[PDB]
Enzyme design. Sequence first.
Site, PDB file in Angstrom:
ATOM      1  CB  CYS A   1      -1.185  -0.078   1.010  1.00 45.39           C
ATOM      2  SG  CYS A   1      -2.108   1.442   1.451  1.00 45.39           S
TER       3      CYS A   1
ATOM      4  CD  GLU B   1      -2.754  -6.097   5.065  1.00 42.17           C
ATOM      5  OE1 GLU B   1      -2.098  -6.446   3.982  1.00 42.17           O
ATOM      6  OE2 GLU B   1      -3.269  -4.989   5.235  1.00 42.17           O
TER       7      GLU B   1
ATOM      8  CG  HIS C   1      -4.519  -3.677   2.393  1.00 42.69           C
ATOM      9  ND1 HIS C   1      -3.841  -3.129   3.482  1.00 42.69           N
ATOM     10  CD2 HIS C   1      -5.025  -2.667   1.643  1.00 42.69           C
ATOM     11  CE1 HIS C   1      -3.948  -1.815   3.365  1.00 42.69           C
ATOM     12  NE2 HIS C   1      -4.641  -1.504   2.269  1.00 42.69           N
TER      13      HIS C   1
END
Lengths: 1057, 379
Positions: B268, B354, B352
């Site tokens: 990001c 994650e 993202h």
Amino acid sequence: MPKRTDIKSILILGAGPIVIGQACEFDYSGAQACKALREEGYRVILVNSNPATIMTDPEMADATYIEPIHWEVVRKIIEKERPDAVLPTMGGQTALNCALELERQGVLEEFGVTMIGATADAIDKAEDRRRFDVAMKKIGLETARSGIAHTMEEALAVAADVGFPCIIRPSFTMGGSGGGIAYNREEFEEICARGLDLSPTKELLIDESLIGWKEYEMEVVRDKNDNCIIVCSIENFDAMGIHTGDSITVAPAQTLTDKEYQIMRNASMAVLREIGVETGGSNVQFAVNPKNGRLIVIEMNPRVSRSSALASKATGFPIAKVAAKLAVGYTLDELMNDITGGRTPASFEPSIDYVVTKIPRFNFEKFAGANDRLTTQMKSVGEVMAIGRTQQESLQKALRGLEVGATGFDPKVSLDDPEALTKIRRELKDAGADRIWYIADAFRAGLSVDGVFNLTNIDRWFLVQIEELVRLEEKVAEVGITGLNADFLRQLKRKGFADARLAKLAGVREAEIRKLRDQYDLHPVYKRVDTCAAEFATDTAYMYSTYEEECEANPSTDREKIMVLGGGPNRIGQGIEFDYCCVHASLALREDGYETIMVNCNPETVSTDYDTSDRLYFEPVTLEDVLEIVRIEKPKGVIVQYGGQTPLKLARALEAAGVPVIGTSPDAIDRAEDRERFQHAVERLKLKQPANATVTAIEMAVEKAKEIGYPLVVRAMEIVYDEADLRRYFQTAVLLDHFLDDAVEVDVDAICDGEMVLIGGIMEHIEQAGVHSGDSACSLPAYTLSQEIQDVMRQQVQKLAFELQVRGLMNVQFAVKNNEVYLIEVNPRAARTVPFVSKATGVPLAKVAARVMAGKSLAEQGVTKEVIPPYYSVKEVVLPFNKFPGVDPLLGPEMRSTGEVMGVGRTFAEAFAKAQLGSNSTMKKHGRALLSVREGDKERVVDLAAKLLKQGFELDATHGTAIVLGEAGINPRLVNKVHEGRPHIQDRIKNGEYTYIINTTSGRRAIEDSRVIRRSALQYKVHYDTTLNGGFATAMALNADATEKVISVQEMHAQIK
Amino acid sequence: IKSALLVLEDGTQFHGRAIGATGSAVGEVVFNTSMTGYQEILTDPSYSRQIVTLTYPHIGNVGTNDADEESSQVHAQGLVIRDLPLIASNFRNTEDLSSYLKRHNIVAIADIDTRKLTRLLREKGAQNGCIIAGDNPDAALALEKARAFPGLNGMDLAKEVTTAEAYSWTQGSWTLTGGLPQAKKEDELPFHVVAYDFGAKRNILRMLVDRGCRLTIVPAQTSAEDVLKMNPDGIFLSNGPGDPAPCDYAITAIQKFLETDIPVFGICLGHQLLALASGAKTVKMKFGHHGGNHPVKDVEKNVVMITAQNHGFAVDEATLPANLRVTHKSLFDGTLQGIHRTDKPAFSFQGHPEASPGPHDAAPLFDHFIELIEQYRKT
Ligand SMILES: Nc1ncnc2c1ncn2[C@@H]1O[C@H](COP(=O)(O)OP(=O)(O)O)[C@@H](O)[C@H]1O
Ligand SMILES: Nc1ncnc2c1ncn2[C@@H]1O[C@H](COP(=O)(O)OP(=O)(O)O)[C@@H](O)[C@H]1O
Ligand SMILES: NC(=O)CC[C@H](N)C(=O)O
Ligand SMILES: NC(=O)CC[C@H](N)C(=O)O
Ligand SMILES: CC[N+](CC)(CC)CC
Ligand SMILES: NCCC[C@H](N)C(=O)O
Ligand SMILES: [Cl-]
Ligand SMILES: [Cl-]
Ligand SMILES: [Cl-]
Ligand SMILES: [Cl-]
Ligand SMILES: [Cl-]
Ligand SMILES: [Cl-]
Ligand SMILES: [Cl-]
Ligand SMILES: [K+]
Ligand SMILES: [K+]
Ligand SMILES: [K+]
Ligand SMILES: [K+]
Ligand SMILES: [K+]
Ligand SMILES: [K+]
Ligand SMILES: [K+]
Ligand SMILES: [Mn+2]
Ligand SMILES: [Mn+2]
Ligand SMILES: [Mn+2]
Ligand SMILES: [Mn+2]
């Protein structure tokens, strides 16, 4: 990645006739698969016995086969068409099963037919319950504790391990067919026996109970490049233990945290991968323990489904369309998302900014002795869907679009009934089709949310909202219309409250509440479905109403609009047939240049697909809802005649409120519909009608009855044989009519433009008058009626067309007794036979009549002559008795069928054979026939026995029937009635002695005592006929071969002069 | 009556009900299409100075719990939703949404036409606004604050959320069964990674630990020097709020790291930084990427991933140096999503990997990072 070059042609397996658990969803999907592959330049071949389908329309595919869905029959289609591939995922269980038979039978090999969409092995891995469960073990997912059983002894061992209550689910069935929950050894035995024999692989999976856990479903899509998306998540309102098809359900999932959701999502993908679906859709089901989030996989369906259809409607993503393309090589990245004008790919996960609610529609009242409690075996006949911005709004809208007379949470129980809490308690604890309503009533009565949770297992997230609506309702009753200030009214409207519900609570006319909203400038706004939660613009007009700020309707000014009112959820007698009509009105008029607007809320049909109309308002078909749409659209006309009862019942009110209803006027309709009005018209025109009266009291009856003469048709329709028979009714129990015994019933569909009358089709039913037209097999052309007799009918219809001032469709029902024509009824609207006539005659009656309604004369269309096809077309029905075992599987004046099939032949016998086999008849051309007929049939039964003996059948007969046979030189082997000794009929049926049974009865008593023959034949899958006419038809069919020849609809149509 | 109001820079007003703290909130307004994961969203530092609008109508259905906190606090300035459910219904719930918001003193409004808001944002683009919750919220005043808001373009927010002092992180991922694991010892974790805190989410860390990484979280402005002094197996550049561009200290360090052979992976903001550091330019998006259904294609493998997004700025690919290769692209708009340096062990991704909340589809991204690390530990 791009389209497949090795595949030029494709055979698509249709679902067949509409049945509980396998409905309209398959026409929607099948239609979509055809559309998608045809757009891609593929040769489309398909088989569908169900004529009332859009997917069997001639222009939708290259070679369309309206033939029985039997492997041998398909084989003849393969042979003839030589398909490169076959797509077996678009037609429910019927298509999966057929595909595997053809595999098994080596037909796929024989003709180098490639199986696309899903492989035979993938299908089996999913459908074989043993295999599925092993598959789970492999991927580390959990399943409840269970056991397989191929025999009853095996089954009890399993029942002993898992304990009671236990759930039973056969392999190779869906919709909960053959399964159930057993609470005791007695029910275990009955269900296991039924499942064992209904399973195509004779296996059952028996599981420990997870009753009450939350139930979830996910719709998954996968491409050859391994890309995988979750199209929609679904949370069931009714917990584990009530089939998802019979449960209220919502999208998206509501009570799972993101962490749980991902686990679920991942599992879903692993399931597909493991099962082996790489080019298409699949539905995955799970159970979640609310106490700790424990996830249990339940099953997976390797094809399109009733959930995939609901998912498509809910999200705006057309699953079936995409899956079709994907079976021919396409990938998701390469396909464009339809509702975002193609600016976005299909490779994405939809996001919805609203709440979608589905409520099942039931018909328990049609099957009185049936157990009416909801279980793992579906019993619903249709479904309603609604979209709202909040759950509350979504839920009430759905309740009001249910077509059950509800306006929302209408009370079922009175507050001053002392035993009220007991009935409520029973209804919550052991759900029936009315539970939803009982839930509100419990809150009205003081039960707490917890109290309700404990009994229903329904997540408190939903319960609290219902409780809140109840408190709100309490307040409205208290403050009255006076307390309905702009602010409160707005609040209620935003919660889903119908004007009718508010009027009721406040003690005023609904119209007064409606007027009040205008005063306060309180009209709903319309929002659009776009699959992405407004992230992207749409060029599609797929809308739902809501009480919000901004409106997205943006009605054109530029054009001439025609609105079409749908019928809402399907129910018995209100099928896919009306929807076909609706679709046809929209397709025709749009093609004609009109801008069309469809108003409907059934998620299973083509009418609610966005490609069907210019504008789709996915709303409850109610006065309130429709009025709000007309308000903003100001259409030129509104069609009320094609959607069945639903819209019909709104016509007068619409017109009154200023709606431009086109076609046959609401008064004209009522003129027909009105017994009083009618009986007058018939005379005026000097037409024959059965002797009738309208009695209030018993004793007025006996008399009036004595006068009209028995038998009598008591309009819950019964036929009373004698005086003694009437009280019997009267008591247990007004229109009184003379029953026309031994009469030939006829259905005539026609079009009237005010200038001329077009005879659509003259259909002679096989079963006589007294057996509902909806449950009767019928022929086109007529197979026994005289040209002369039919010419009389023809003239009689023309006379009535003009008299009632029909403009569009009409249907007239006659009875022919002793070479005399009598009038049964006039239905000045589209009738359920239309699609049949259209298919047999190649003339699109719903399109023509639509144009006529819109202003194009028949003359003008070049549609003036009546068409008598060169071939015979026969329609046969499918009855749901197998779903309600406790019901007597016997025909009568009330309609109970769910669907229909079409048979085409060179001879009536060929057509009848095709109808019969397409209807899933177990009739054979050998064995022993059982003859047990009534008095009035004894004489005529002689010829029938002759026939059968001639076909190589041996004969068995009950006493009286044997007597008469014997007296004509035929000596059947006698059988004992159950009270007579052993073995009796039941032992013989049970023991497989018969391949065919003919059992006709008369009299309430007689029927009641003969019930075992019919229940037995059904239970044991013996073909049976309850009418001598049916018998004769079946006897003829024996001289035919339903697999010999096949013909396409296109071929049928070309053959027409 | 508990009134709340939301006013945008253009005067557009949204009247509804107060569900959080009494007060005012001002920030750039955004819409997130995520159907689940509101909590994670709330606590993501990337939302600093933003008024988050959620498109899914019912928000707070499952209440809240600590495992679902992506940071020490709620970073959203405000929260705008259509409906606050009567109750939270989930076994993981420790506190209903209203209470939690009040607890974190967040100004929030419910009962507003969020879809009207979304379409405005989409068609006209990002807009600043203000929420006023309280007795008689003054619209003129909300208009005023919304107008006074400076805007996020050119704003360095990374320096605002960053950790004062540097710390170690040795905890992995949560499990249904185990929940959030105990923090691991250091001799357990094979590698040593230095992650620059630019408003880092707990998940990325956990996911790093999961793959054998012991972490040393350093303040956003950490110098390359004191970094290169820790003998890092690899260097991580976290996600975070505002404009990446105004982050000179980061670009400088990173450039220093890139003179090295130490592997660098950013997510990001980190990703943006890495691109800037490589001579790439960043741009502000009309409305941004905020949702959990974003299709992203790995151009290399020709495959698609469903991913979690959350960014208002992007890397202009038409300004990409020739040392940066395009690894991924958004299937929705064609925007740049991943890059790899042709000359160094450096790669980054916009979305993202994650998740939390969202699809696990881009997790394998971490893997390449680890590969590089193992390899670095080779030579
Ligand atoms: N172990 C179980 N305990 C309780 N209900 C169950 C259990 N397993 C399945 N069910 C219920 O049975 C219904 C039918 O099972 P399912 O596997 O979906 O079969 P079908 O293929 O006939 O639709 C489900 O929708 C669910 O409510
Ligand atoms: N007078 C009658 N004599 C004999 N059969 C009748 C008579 N009236 C009705 N029936 C039978 O009952 C069926 C239903 O009758 P109908 O008046 O059309 O009711 P519905 O409104 O359900 O169509 C008919 O299709 C026919 O089989
Ligand atoms: N509602 C409409 O008329 C659609 C307008 C436009 N295409 C949009 O997506 O906003
Ligand atoms: N016609 C019939 O069906 C005869 C009645 C029947 N077999 C009985 O056991 O009473
Ligand atoms: C559900 C449809 N059937 C099984 C596939 C039973 C009516 C068709 C034979
Ligand atoms: N068309 C009705 C179904 C026929 C059934 N076999 C019966 O005669 O009862
Ligand atoms: Cl078959
Ligand atoms: Cl089945
Ligand atoms: Cl458990
Ligand atoms: Cl039953
Ligand atoms: Cl009030
Ligand atoms: Cl009809
Ligand atoms: Cl608003
Ligand atoms: K082939
Ligand atoms: K299955
Ligand atoms: K198990
Ligand atoms: K259920
Ligand atoms: K299902
Ligand atoms: K009939
Ligand atoms: K409001
Ligand atoms: Mn199934
Ligand atoms: Mn199922
Ligand atoms: Mn009728
Ligand atoms: Mn009728």
